[PDB]
Structures are given as structure tokens and as C-alpha cells.
Design an enzyme around this catalytic site. Structure first.
Site, mmCIF file in Angstrom:
data_model
loop_
_atom_site.group_PDB
_atom_site.id
_atom_site.type_symbol
_atom_site.label_atom_id
_atom_site.label_comp_id
_atom_site.label_asym_id
_atom_site.label_seq_id
_atom_site.Cartn_x
_atom_site.Cartn_y
_atom_site.Cartn_z
ATOM 1 C CB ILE D 38 -0.956 0.022 1.202
ATOM 2 C CG1 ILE D 38 -2.019 -1.067 1.059
ATOM 3 C CG2 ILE D 38 -1.618 1.383 1.338
ATOM 4 C CD1 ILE D 38 -3.059 -1.046 2.153
ATOM 5 C CG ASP D 39 0.760 3.546 -3.540
ATOM 6 O OD1 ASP D 39 -0.329 3.333 -2.969
ATOM 7 O OD2 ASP D 39 0.838 3.857 -4.745
#
Ligand code: CDL
Ligand code: CDL
Ligand code: F8L
Ligand code: PNS
Ligand SMILES: OC[C@H]1O[C@H](OC[C@H]2O[C@H](O)[C@@H](O)[C@@H]2O)[C@@H](O)[C@@H]1O
Ligand code: CA
Lengths: 31, 500, 198, 93, 182, 99
Positions: D38-39
């Protein structure tokens, strides 16, 4: 006085005239 | 002798130039559009969010696919083939400065490119420096580097941590982008620019949905308008709007609790209808109607119920539909249809976001549907899918992985389908159009390995794969291991074969 | 392609309609069997084989040497038994929502607009007195295909307006009264009996 | 609503819609960028969606200081214990 | 012996190429040997004495400033030639015409730009006479690159002066429909 | 429904246009009693219809009683009545009791 109460007006006006002045380009005098 | 005279009156009805009022309106309907967008941005900045980095941390990365795609689009831009409409457009763009308007030079009595010629007025400016073949085709390389930079860093990471984390998906996306961009989007036809506008629109809509703002959703409408103003086939840019209209309306009906409805609807209209001030700069509605009358009374009309011609011209073994001119469509259909039938069955694939993955398929379906109602039915209109087939193939390569398709029968059936698609691809000549056809290996005949064609070999392999799938069907076997080796990323290899 | 050729008597409107409705029923029943686990009322055992038979037939039709458009007549036994299950599954489907019904109706209207764009000719002697054998159907001076197209686009706009508001009106179903129990299933009977009467 | 098994159950429902990660993978020990892919452009989407379903405004300067899921549950517990006038408890618990 | 290369369609006049590489460095004399050896009529032969042409590049013969009528296919292969510019409704008069190969020039770049549907071949049929020239593709003989024609005037004439003026219309004005079809 | 379909199928056996091969399969069946085999009468250098000639070998026995077009197309109407009866009594009651 506010930085949002004026942005709302600048988004309504100058966003409505920028549309009524864009559908009237095909209908204008040309030389 | 006194009295003799012959007084003809030339029909110079297209050589017009705006008055001192049309200019005042055109230089105002843009100032009072950028001002509306700046006001909308100042409104959107209310939530308290800013920009901390000019480059997101998911951009500063380099893979072995970036090198391949860049070096395969930078050496195909030099030695590669050109489309059939480059002389056509170059001839119509070298004379547009002297004529006074964008005249259709070889047909229709010099009637201009009515509403659809704001792009050719950029080539008309580029031809002032030089008209060489290595320079006049620069917006076709820039709009490919930009297309790849978007497709590999904004579209694939958005589709979930399973499409961004698997290398086979990146390879498939790159190779399908290459295979669909090589034969179609290398000339001067403005399909490589429509394929990039229809991708910038999707990217801006996804950014709007992500951040929950509207200022990257008016720019999406501006991009869709400026992409539809290029050619009538730019309806993919508005299909990208229809596909992402519901989550945008969800923000329009959610921000209006603080600001109201007009300061949100007015700029969305000013940005949408600003394309008229650029389309009707030189021309006029009367001359546009006259040109359209001429083009529809003389040229190919091609009513909407004659859309099967676009695919009838594809199955004939000629230079129009060749070995290379089929990939762009077959690697989109073969990667779209089973992925649709698999997204229908499964509703949780554990690594794929459903919103973006459904918008990406709705865009392609709406585009393939509304490719009817276009005035002409050519094959060059298959270059639009160059950008949205890369993402579709990168999603299919994940949907058909041995961890998402768990049964060996389904993966063997998909391998059979891929082999059959290759067999259909290799069943035509290898001809290029005018001078790229000089020296091609099989430029005049169907490729043969000696007596037997190459399409027959791939068909005899697809039949064996289908028999293997049927034998796994009857006996109810799902744990086979050889199919685990054979059916690992079969789309990247099928695309790399055609690219090579 | 042969099935849909402009100004041809191989693919008439009566021949385009049959194949388009067969494909609609097949690809709608398959979508309903994938999306929903089953069709309530109809056992899901043979309902899957009835679609598998049609799909494998349309696939096996690749190997035939001659590919005229009159060879679709071998599916006139499957289309009859398939359009009677489609008009029963889609009843329950389009009764649970006002958007699926609009999509069904506009798909039927687009199929009609596509079919009616062709001739009505039959053959050498069959065209002796047929109304529209030489030209595509017109009512007074307007073609019928444009009428059905401007009806299909209205249906599509209505489906879009019912789709865009599924987040504000929540999800409300139609009342199971007499006027709606037999309204979601009368399509594909209306157009089918119109084509038969024609 | 300082129950950890409720904060995590509510965070997994946003993570599964934004990104697609299953709700069984979100443990109070994982990291948002190493274990879950998850950026930050998804963390901002999660922080946007959590202010639409529930009423919670996660400041931009403190959203960057949320590495692990345990950090998120601790930050929410802290926001909740010192603000008992949580009028955002309307029909959304 | 030296077998010739034959490019164009073969009921008609063509050039037959004998590259001077297939002849040795001791060939000081050349003579034709033509043999029909066929009874049926319809197939035949014709012979012109051999000639060693004095060739010249198209860029050198057709200058970079003479007006040329390039078909809509030949535009990127000839970037330095100048097209037939038009201004104020009056078109220039070309000198040469460049077109693609036979089976393309016949069915693509003659039905498209035809005189009856707006093309530029409605002017150069009323005003000019086209005579095909003899061109070759360097070092790749037997290849059909296209054809280069030469436009000679029917009668000697001079360009006009074309009196000018200006008028302001109203955006909806249209002086009437064009002349499209009878 | 059976009555309506059979009526509209029997008032089409009379007033109804024949297909494109009603004259091909008819002469093929008429000239097949003599000539020794089921010759393809208009093409293929007299090559028979070798794998597909069991239907013409029945038409050639129907084309000996009477060549009237209302009688030769009788196996193309019984094969429709039986098809509809099957569809409506053995297929639809099998797919479901409420369909
Ligand atoms: C004119 C005549 C028109 C003919 C109409 C005939 C077509 C009707 C068929 C509909 C297929 C439904 C498929 C399905 O069951 O999916 C359920 C499935 C349910 O989703 P979900 O699982 O709940 O999850 C949703 C996600 O959360 C989030 O999903 P989302 O809601 O964000 O998705 C939004 C987006 C994306 O949603 C999708 O459209 C999904 C893709 C749809 C394609 C389905 C086509 C099926 C084709 C059958 C196969 C053909 C051959 C295949 C095999 C051949 C083998 C060779 O929807 C769009 O509006 C794109 C437009 C698609 C138009 C397709 C036209 C063809 O997907 C849908 O959501 C279906 C919604 C359908 C959208 C309504 C369409 C109308 C709205 C706009 C209409 C245009 C109006 C404006 C102008 C138009 C005319 C001028
Ligand atoms: C040569 C290659 C040609 C193309 C290769 C393509 C292969 C892929 C296609 C195969 C799948 C399509 C066929 C089945 C689809 C429908 C099946 C179904 O619904 O269930 C019935 C049945 C299963 O029902 P069930 O097990 O009772 O269901 C229980 C549950 O419902 C559980 O149900 P389920 O969930 O398990 O099943 C769901 C079903 C449902 O999902 C779907 O996706 C169905 C929708 C597919 C749509 C296909 C429509 C295509 C129509 C074209 C229409 C054109 C329109 C476009 C133009 C429009 C423009 C106007 O999904 C699948 O079945 C996909 C897996 C299929 C396993 C197949 C294993 C055998 C592969 C057979 C491939 C060979 C077939 C072609 C043969 C001849 C080709 C030349 O499906 C089958 O098992 C049929 C397989 C038997 C086929 C035998 C043929 C083998 C012959 C071997 C030799 C091959 C060539 C030899 C010639 C060479 C001599 C020179
Ligand atoms: C026996 C088996 C197993 C056959 C396998 C079937 C397949 C897929 C191909 C068979 C390949 C062969 C043997 C083809 C032989 C026939 C051929 C080469 C071409 C077809 C000849 C026919 C009868 C075509 C029928 O197609 P048609 O267009 O419907 O024919 C008209 O209708 C009448 C009735 O058929 C005919 O008299 C008319 O010619
Ligand atoms: C938001 C942030 C400061 C930090 O986000 P991060 O977690 O990805 O590092 C940075 O990523 C960013 O988004 N900067 C502005 C975005 C932008 O305009 N990038 C231009 C590339 S198209
Ligand atoms: O679209 C660019 C320009 O060229 C288009 O003509 C179509 C050409 O491509 C076809 O293969 C050819 O038949 C034709 O030459 C113009 O319509 C358009 O203005
Ligand atoms: Ca002779």
C-alpha cells in the site's frame, strides 16, 4: 471578507461567462 | 477590343480570418476558464491537503521492462514502418500556411477539416522548422514515452497490489503496448495521440477518485474535449468519462454541503465547452456545415449499421489486414472477454481492486461499441487500443495466474485459446504499406515453413491443447504439474513473439 | 458478415432477428448463470448443458467448408427452448431492479433497430408481392431503423439516469403486483410476435 | 469504540475496497508498505474514505506517521480517549 | 547471355534492364537475340535498339522549388520536393506528378483524388498533358517504386492577376451551396 | 401454444418461400434414380455427394411418387412439428416445473 466567499463567486461568475462566451464563437462576424 | 469582358468570381469562402470581436471573445473564453479552474482549485484545497513530493515514491523505480520498451520504441521510431496516411497529412500540412486554412488537399473541392483539425495546425507549425520524416513524427514518440510512463506507474499500481507486484503483468503490458503501437501509431495519423488522451483522462479521473477532489476532474473533461476535437474517433475519451461518472457524481453531491452547487457545476461546464474557442478559431459554423455536407454527399458515408466492414477488412489476407495489423485487436479481445467472464464469477480476487478493474473494462466495451457511428470504417481505428490493451493484458495475466485460476482445465483451455489466436494472427501476409514493404521477408505471401503454413502449426498445437483440456475435463483432474509450467504467463510470450 | 450485408437477401431482417435474438438469449443466460449462482425455478443442471450445447455448436461451426448465412437454421431447435428460459430468468432478474429491465428493453430495441436496417426479400420467386423486398422498411418517409434507434437511445439514457442515482435513492425494488409480474417478461414476446406476424 | 478488534475490522473494510487486500491479511503487526503493498497514494485514499463513512479528519502531518496497523489503532485510541465529546458516533458505530 | 528485369504490366511498352555487372570486363559488344517461338496470337514481342541511359537523380532533375503533384501515398518518401500550393481558391500549375506503384496508383490514388469528386485530377486533365518518364530504383532493379510523369501545357498561357477585396460576414452567412454533382 | 405454432407452421408449408437449394436437391434427387449414383448434377465433373447422400437417397424415393413441391417438403414439416412437441413437452418440463 473571506478567501472562500470570494472563490465561490469567482467560480460561479467567470465560469458561467466563460461558457456563454464559448457557445457564441461559431456565431460571430468573420472577415 | 472595347467591350469584351469575362468576369468570374472565385469561391473563397473558407479563407476567413477572425474580426476584432471574435478575437476578443476567444481570448476571453480562455482567461475566464483558467480563472474558473483556479477558483475551483482554491475551493478543493479546503480539506487541508497539500503536495509533499513532485514525484511519488512509486515512480522512482526502474525495471527491466522500462529499458526494453524505451529501446524498442526508440529504434522502431528510426527503422520502423509508417502508416498509409502520412503523405496525405504531410501534403495537407505543408500547404496550410499558404492556403490560409486546413484544406483537405486531395478531395472534396478543398473543403477544410471542419471541426476536427486542431491537431494538424500543430504539424503545420512543426513543418516550418523541417519536414523530414525523423522530425515531423516527434509527437508520436513523445506520446508513446508518456503513454508508457502513465501505463506503468499510474494505471498498473492502481489496479491492486497483485497487478503491481507481479512481473509477468508488467512484461505483458509492455509487450502488448509495443505490439499495438508498432504498426498503427508510428505514422502521422493522430491515433497515438487519441490513445494518450483517453489514458490521461482515465488517470486524472482515478486521481480525482483517490484524493476526493474535483480539480483533477475538470482537467479530465478538458482532456476529453481536446481529444474528441482531434478526430471523430476520439469518443474513447468520453467513454472514459462515462465509465468514471458515478464516483465523480459521488463527490459532486458530497462537497456541495460546504460550498454549494454552482461553484462546482460552473467550472465543469466552462472547461467542457472551451473546445469551441479552439475548434472554431479560423472556420465558422456555416463553412463547417458546408464542408460536412460535401463530405457526406461525396466521400465514404458508411452508415452505422455497416460496422461489420471494419472486421471484414481484417480477415482478408491483404496489406490492410496483415500479420501485424491484427495483434492490436486480437490481444485486446482475447484478454478482455475471459477476464470479464472471470470478474463476473469471482467477486474477491484478493489482490485486484474492483473499481478500477471494472472501469478499465467498461471503457474498452464502450469504445468497441461506440466505434460505430463513426463516419468511416477503416482498420487504422484499431490503434486507439494501444494504451488500453496494455492494462487489459496486464490484468488478464494476473486473472489467469496459477494462483487465481486454480484448476488445470481452465488454464489449459486458456492456453489453447492463446494458441488459436496466434494461429489466426499468422494466417496472412507480412506486407507493409508503401516503402516499408521493400525487402520484407514474406511481403507477398502467407508465411510457410516449407509446404505447411505457420498458422497450421499453431492450429495443430491449439487442437492438442484443447484435447488436453477435454481430457482434464472428463477425468476431473486439477492438480496437474506440467500445466503449471506450460500455463505460467502465456500472454507475455504470445505478445513477445509478435513483437520480435 | 454474410448474415449482415447491406442490400442483401441472404441476410434479411427476418434472418438477422433470429440470430441476434439467439445470441442475446445465450449471452444473457450465461451472464445470469455466472453472476447469480442459479436461476430460481429452473434446475441448474440441464440449464448449463443447454447453453454449453449452443456455445459448442457455434464453435464447431468453424470447421465447415462453406459458411453461408442460411446454415444458422440448425439452431432453430435450441433458440426456441432457450428463449423460453431467457424470458423467465430475466423476469426475476429485472423485477429486482429498475435498471436491468431498462437494459433488457434497450437491448431488444437495439437488436430491432439493427435487424430492421436490412431488406425483406426471400428468394427468386418468394419476392412476388412481399412489401419491402427491394428496399429497407420505411413508414411514411422515415426509415424504421432510425425510429428504433431513437427509441433505443432514449432507453439507454433512461438506464443511465437510473444507474447514476442508485446511490441516492438507495436500492428499492418494484412491488410484486399484477402490473409488474407480467411487465418484466412480456418483452421478447412482444418483438418476437411482431416479427412472426410480419 | 476503542476496541482494537473493531478498529481493525473497520480498517480492513476500507483497505479491501481501496486496494483489494483481503481482510484476513490485516494484522496489528504488518507494515503498510513492506508487508502490504500500500503506497502513499493509497494511504491518502484510505484517509479520504475514512472521513466519508465515519467522521474522522486525519491530519496530513500525522497521516505520514502511520507505519503499521498497530500504529493506526493506537492513534485512533488516542484520538478517542482525549475527546469524549465524539459527536461523530451518530449511526456509524 | 544476360536475362533482363521486367517490372511493369506486360501487355504494354516497358524498359528491360540489363545491369552492367552481369556482363564481364571484356564485353566490348552487345547484340539482342529475341525469339518468339509461339504460334498463338495475343502474345508477341517488340524490340528497340539497346541504349546505355544517361541517368540523373530525381532530387537533381526535379528541383527543390518546382511545383509537383504528389499523390496522397508519396509524401514521406519525397520530403524535399515542393507540392502544388493553392491560395485564394486559385491553384498553381504543376510540372511533374509522382504516384505509387501500378496496382496502387490504379485503384487507390486515382479513384480517391478523381476530378468528379473534388480531387486534383480534374484540373490536370483539363489543363495539362501527362507523359510518363523513365525512372529506375538505384541498385534495386526489378522493383516497382512508382512512376514519375511530366506535365506539358496544351496551350501556352500565363497566370492571372486575380483582383482582390474584403468583406465582413456574420457567422451564419452562406452565399449558397457549392456545385457538387449534377 | 401447440395449436398456434402448428397452425402457423402448416399455413406456412403452403404459402411460404422455398430456400436457395430447393431446386438443387430436387434435380439431384430426380436424376439419381438413373445415372447409377447420387451425382452432383450442376458441378464437380459428375462427382457424387459421397459422404452426404442418404437424404438425397430418400428424396429420390419421394420424388418418384409425385414431384409436387407441397409433397417433397413433407419431411421438413414433420421434423418441425416433432421438434416443437419435443421442445414443449420433454425439454421445458425438464429444465423446470415452474418454467
Ligand atoms: C444504444 C443501444 C445500447 C445497447 C445496450 C446493450 C448493452 C447492455 C448490456 C449491459 C451489460 C451488463 C454486464 C453486467 O451484468 O455487469 C454487472 C456488473 C456489476 O458490477 P458489480 O459487480 O456490482 O461491481 C461494480 C463495481 O463496484 C464498480 O463498477 P462501476 O459501477 O464503477 O462500473 C461503471 C462502468 C463499468 O461497468 C461495466 O460496464 C462493466 C462492463 C460491461 C460490459 C458488458 C458487456 C457484455 C458483453 C457480452 C459479451 C459479448 C460477446 C462476448 C463473447 C464473444 C466471444 C467472441 O459502467 C459504465 O457505464 C460503462 C459503460 C458500459 C456500456 C456498455 C455498452 C455495450 O458490472 C456492472 O456494474 C454493470 C453496470 C452496467 C452499467 C449500466 C450501463 C448503462 C449506463 C450508461 C449507458 C450509456 C448512457 C449514455 C449514452 C448511451 C447511449 C447514447
Ligand atoms: C481449437 C480451439 C478452438 C477455440 C479454443 C477455445 C477453447 C475455449 C472455449 C471452451 C469454453 C467454451 C466452450 C464451453 C462454453 C460453455 C460450456 C458450458 O457452459 O458448460 C457446459 C459444459 C460444462 O457444463 P457442466 O460441467 O455440466 O457445468 C457444471 C457447472 O455449471 C460448472 O460450470 P463451469 O463453471 O465449470 O463452466 C463454466 C463455463 C462457463 O463460462 C463461459 O465462459 C461460457 C461462455 C463462453 C462463450 C463462448 C461463445 C462462443 C460463441 C461465438 C459467438 C460469436 C458471436 C460474435 C459475433 C457477433 C457479431 C454480430 O466456463 C468454462 O467451461 C470454461 C472452461 C471450459 C472447459 C473446457 C474444457 C474443454 C475445452 C473445450 C474447448 C474446445 C471447444 C471448441 C471445440 C471446437 C472449436 C474448433 O462445458 C463443457 O464442458 C464443454 C466442453 C466439451 C467441449 C468438447 C470439445 C472438445 C473437442 C476437442 C477437439 C478440439 C478441436 C478439434 C478439431 C480439430 C480437427 C481438425
Ligand atoms: C463424415 C465426417 C466426420 C465429416 C466431418 C465434417 C467436417 C467438419 C468437414 C467434412 C469435410 C468434408 C468431407 C467436406 C466434403 C464436402 C465438401 C468438401 C464441401 C461440402 C459439400 C456440401 C454438401 C456442402 C453442403 O453445404 P451446403 O451449402 O448446405 O450445400 C448445398 O445444400 C445442399 C444440401 O447440402 C447441397 O446439395 C448444396 O450444395
Ligand atoms: C504526496 C507526496 C508529497 C508524498 O506522497 P508519497 O507517499 O508517495 O511519497 C508526493 O508523493 C506527491 O504526491 N507530490 C505531488 C504529486 C505530483 O504532482 N506528482 C507529479 C508527477 S505526475
Ligand atoms: O484522417 C486523415 C486524413 O486522411 C483520411 O483519409 C483516409 C485515408 O486512409 C484510407 O486507407 C485511405 O483510403 C484514405 O486515403 C482523411 O479522411 C482524413 O482527412
Ligand atoms: Ca506470335
Amino acid at each position: 471578507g473571506k478567501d472562500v466567499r470570494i472563490a465561490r463567486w469567482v467560480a460561479t461568475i467567470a465560469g458561467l461567462l466563460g461558457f456563454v462566451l464559448s457557445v457564441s464563437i461559431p456565431l460571430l462576424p468573420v472577415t | 477590343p472595347q467591350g469584351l469582358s469575362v468576369s468570374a468570381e472565385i469561391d473563397t469562402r473558407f479563407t476567413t480570418h477572425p474580426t476584432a470581436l471574435k478575437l476578443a471573445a476567444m481570448l476571453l473564453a480562455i482567461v475566464s476558464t483558467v480563472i474558473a479552474l483556479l477558483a475551483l482549485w482554491r475551493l478543493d484545497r479546503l480539506d487541508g491537503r497539500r503536495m509533499h513530493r513532485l514525484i511519488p515514491t512509486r515512480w522512482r523505480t526502474v525495471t527491466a521492462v522500462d529499458g526494453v520498451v524505451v529501446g524498442g520504441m526508440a529504434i522502431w521510431y528510426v527503422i520502423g514502418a509508417n502508416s498509409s496516411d502520412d503523405g496525405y497529412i504531410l501534403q495537407m500540412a505543408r500547404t496550410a500556411e499558404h492556403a490560409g486554412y486546413m484544406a483537405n488537399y486531395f478531395r472534396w473541392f478543398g473543403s477544410p477539416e471542419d471541426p476536427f483539425g486542431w491537431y494538424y495546425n500543430v504539424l503545420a507549425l512543426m513543418t516550418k522548422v523541417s519536414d523530414a520524416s525523423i522530425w515531423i513524427r516527434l509527437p508520436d514518440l513523445i506520446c508513446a514515452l508518456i503513454c508508457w510512463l502513465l501505463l506503468s506507474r499510474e494505471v498498473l499500481p492502481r489496479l491492486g497490489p497483485a497487478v503491481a507486484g507481479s512481473r509477468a503483468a508488467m512484461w505483458a503490458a509492455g509487450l502488448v503496448l509495443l505490439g499495438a503501437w508498432m504498426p498503427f501509431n508510428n505514422g502521422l495519423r493522430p491515433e497515438g495521440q487519441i490513445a494518450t488522451g483517453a489514458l490521461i483522462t482515465y488517470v486524472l479521473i482515478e486521481r480525482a477518485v483517490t484524493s476526493g477532489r474535483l480539480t483533477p476532474a475538470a482537467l479530465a473533461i478538458t482532456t476529453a474535449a481536446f481529444t474528441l476535437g482531434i478526430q471523430p474517433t476520439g469518443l474513447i475519451a468520453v467513454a472514459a468519462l462515462l465509465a468514471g461518472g458515478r464516483p465523480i457524481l459521488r463527490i459532486v453531491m458530497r462537497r456541495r454541503r460546504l460550498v454549494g452547487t454552482w461553484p462546482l457545476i460552473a467550472p465543469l461546464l466552462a472547461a467542457g465547452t472551451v473546445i469551441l474557442a479552439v475548434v472554431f478559431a479560423d472556420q465558422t459554423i456555416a463553412t463547417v456545415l458546408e464542408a460536412t455536407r460535401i463530405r457526406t454527399a461525396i466521400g465514404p458515408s458508411q452508415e452505422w449499421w455497416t460496422e461489420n466492414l471494419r472486421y471484414y477488412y481484417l480477415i482478408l489476407p491483404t496489406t490492410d489486414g496483415a500479420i501485424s495489423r491484427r495483434v492490436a485487436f486480437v490481444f485486446t479481445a482475447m484478454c478482455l472477454f475471459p477476464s470479464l467472464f472471470m470478474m463476473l464469477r469471482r467477486k474477491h480476487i484478493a489482490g485486484v481492486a474492483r473499481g478500477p478493474a471494472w472501469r478499465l473494462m467498461g471503457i474498452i466495451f464502450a469504445t468497441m461499441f461506440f466505434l460505430m457511428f463513426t463516419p468511416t470504417k477503416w482498420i487504422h481505428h484499431f490503434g486507439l487500443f494501444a494504451a488500453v490493451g496494455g492494462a487489459m493484458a496486464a490484468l488478464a495475466t494476473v486473472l489467469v495466474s496459477p494462483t487465481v485460476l486454480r484448476s488445470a482445465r481452465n488454464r489449459m483451455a486458456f492456453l489453447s485459446l492463446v494458441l488459436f489466436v496466434l494461429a489466426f494472427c499468422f494466417a496472412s501476409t507480412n506486407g507493409w504499406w508503401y516503402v516499408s514493404n521493400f525487402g520484407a521477408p514474406f511481403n507477398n505471401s502467407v508465411p510457410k515453413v516449407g509446404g505447411v503454413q505457420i498458422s497450421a502449426i499453431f492450429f495443430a498445437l491449439s487442437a492438442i491443447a484443447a484435447l488436453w483440456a477435454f481430457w482434464l475435463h472428463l477425468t476431473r483432474r486439477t492438480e496437474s504439474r506440467v500445466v503449471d509450467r506450460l500455463t505460467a504467463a502465456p500472454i507475455p510470450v504470445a505478445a513477445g513473439f509478435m513483437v520480435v | 458478415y454474410f448474415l449482415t450485408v447491406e442490400d442483401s437477401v441472404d441476410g434479411s431482417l427476418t434472418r438477422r432477428f433470429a440470430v441476434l435474438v439467439l445470441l442475446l438469449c445465450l449471452f444473457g443466460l450465461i451472464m445470469v448463470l455466472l453472476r447469480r449462482g442459479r436461476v430460481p425455478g429452473a434446475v441448474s443442471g440441464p440449464l448449463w448443458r443447454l447453453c454449453g450445447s449452443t456455445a459448442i455448436g457455434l464453435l464447431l461451426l468453424i470447421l465447415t467448408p462453406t459458411k453461408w448465412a442460411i446454415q444458422f437454421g440448425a439452431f432453430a431447435g435450441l433458440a426456441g427452448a432457450l428463449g423460453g428460459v431467457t424470458a423467465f430468468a430475466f423476469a426475476r432478474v429485472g423485477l429486482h431492479s429498475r435498471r436491468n429491465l431498462a437494459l433488457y428493453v434497450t437491448a431488444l430495441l437495439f437488436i430491432l433497430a439493427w435487424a430492421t436496417s436490412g431488406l425483406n426479400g426471400w428468394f427468386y420467386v418468394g419476392n412476388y408481392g412481399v412489401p419491402w423486398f427491394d428496399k429497407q422498411p420505411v413508414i411514411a418517409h422515415y426509415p424504421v431503423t432510425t425510429i428504433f434507434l431513437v427509441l433505443a437511445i432514449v432507453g439507454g439514457l433512461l438506464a443511465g439516469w437510473l444507474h447514476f442515482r442508485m446511490d441516492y435513492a438507495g436500492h428499492t425494488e418494484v412491488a410484486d403486483t399484477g402490473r409488474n409480474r407480467a411487465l418484466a417478461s412480456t418483452p421478447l414476446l412482444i418483438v418476437a410476435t411482431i416479427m412472426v406476424v410480419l | 469504540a476503542a476496541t482494537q478488534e473493531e478498529i481493525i475490522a473497520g480498517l480492513a473494510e476500507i483497505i479491501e475496497e481501496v486496494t483489494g487486500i483481503e481482510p484476513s491479511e490485516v494484522t496489528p503487526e504488518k507494515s503498510f508498505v513492506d508487508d502490504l503493498d500500500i503506497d502513499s497514494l493509497s494511504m491518502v485514499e484510505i484517509a479520504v474514505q475514512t472521513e466519508d463513512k465515519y467522521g474522522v479528519k486525519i491530519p496530513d502531518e500525522d497521516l505520514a506517521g502511520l507505519r503499521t496497523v498497530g500504529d493506526v489503532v493506537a492513534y485512533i485510541q488516542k484520538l478517542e480517549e482525549e475527546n469524549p465529546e465524539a459527536a461523530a458516533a451518530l449511526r456509524e458505530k | 547471355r544476360v536475362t533482363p528485369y521486367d517490372v511493369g504490366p506486360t501487355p504494354s511498352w516497358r524498359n528491360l534492364r540489363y545491369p552492367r555487372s552481369e556482363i564481364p570486363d571484356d564485353a566490348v559488344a552487345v547484340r539482342v537475340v529475341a525469339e518468339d517461338l509461339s504460334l498463338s496470337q495475343g502474345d508477341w514481342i517488340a524490340v528497340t535498339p539497346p541504349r546505355v541511359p544517361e541517368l540523373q537523380s530525381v532530387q537533381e532533375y526535379v528541383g527543390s522549388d518546382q511545383p509537383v503533384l504528389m499523390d496522397w501515398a508519396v509524401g514521406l518518401a519525397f520530403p524535399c520536393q515542393q507540392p502544388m500550393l493553392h491560395a485564394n481558391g486559385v491553384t498553381e500549375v504543376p510540372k511533374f506528378r509522382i504516384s505509387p506503384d501500378y496496382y496502387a496508383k490504379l485503384q487507390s490514388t486515382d479513384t480517391w483524388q478523381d476530378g468528379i469528386n473534388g480531387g486534383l485530377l480534374g484540373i490536370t486533365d483539363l489543363l495539362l498533358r501527362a507523359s510518363v518518364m523513365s525512372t529506375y530504383l538505384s541498385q534495386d532493379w526489378g522493383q516497382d517504386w512508382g512512376s514519375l510523369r511530366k506535365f506539358d501545357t496544351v496551350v501556352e498561357a500565363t497566370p492571372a492577376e486575380l483582383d482582390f477585396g474584403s468583406q465582413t460576414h456574420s457567422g451564419l452567412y452562406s452565399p449558397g451551396p457549392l456545385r457538387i454533382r449534377p | 401454444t401447440d395449436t398456434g405454432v402448428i397452425g402457423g407452421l402448416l399455413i406456412w408449408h403452403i404459402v411460404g418461400a422455398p430456400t436457395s437449394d430447393d431446386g438443387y436437391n430436387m434435380t439431384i434427387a430426380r436424376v439419381a434414380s438413373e445415372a447409377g449414383y447420387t451425382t452432383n448434377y450442376y458441378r464437380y465433373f459428375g462427382a457424387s455427394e459421397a459422404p452426404f447422400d442418404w437424404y438425397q437417397s430418400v428424396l429420390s424415393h419421394l420424388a418418384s411418387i409425385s414431384t409436387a413441391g407441397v409433397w417433397m417438403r413433407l419431411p421438413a414439416t414433420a421434423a418441425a412439428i416433432a421438434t416443437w412437441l419435443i421442445i414443449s413437452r420433454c425439454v421445458l418440463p425438464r429444465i423446470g416445473r415452474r418454467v
